[model samples]
Target: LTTHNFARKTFLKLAFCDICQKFLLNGFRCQTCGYKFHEHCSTKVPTMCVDW
Candidate 1:
């Protein structure tokens, strides 16, 4: 259910990863829901929170 069409992106400033709970310079984010994740973090978590 967490599988999403995530897109690779870069953050102009440091941002937080929902899974890792650490700062991220660049990462993948769900284009639809805007859920953020680290490149490494995304592989681990595969809800993501999107039923509205």
Candidate 2:
């Protein structure tokens, strides 16, 4: 971690997909762990949402 380039790295953080277990660029996060998902990726498995 560097102090000089802090501003450029503000939004960058570790995240992981909850479904596929893949890493992702997270906009929202969970408190449970490094496990996170993209908004669209967070769609529930065995989904019933018809619009999808």
Candidate 3:
């Protein structure tokens, strides 16, 4: 996914991995909460969100 940094007026091509809390070159985002994670880390996620 792509994110825009309004403050810097720049676009970020990277996403943060929720599980590892690290920036990922490639990742997946949750449709529920917009949390991002690495492809491998996403595989181990327990739920889409706390509500799910």
Candidates sorted by lDDT, best first: 1, 3, 2
lDDT of each: 0.67, 0.39, 0.49
Candidate 1 vs candidate 2, lDDT winner: 1
Collision count for each candidate, in order? 0, 0, 0
lDDT of candidate 2 over 1-52, digit per residue (tens):
1111101111266556556666766344433222344556445522222221
Error of 1 at 49 (Å): 4.4
* Steric clash pairs (candidate 1): none
* Best model per lDDT: 1
CA lDDT of 46 in candidate 2?
26
Error of 3 at 13 (Å): 5.7
In order of TM-score, best first, we have: 1, 3, 2
lDDT of 1 by residue, 1-52 (tens): 4556667888666678878767766678776656678766766555464745
Model 3 stretches with alpha carbons more than 4 Å out: 1-14
Alpha-carbon shift of residue 16 in model 3 (angstroms) = 1.5
- TM-score attained by model 3: 0.45
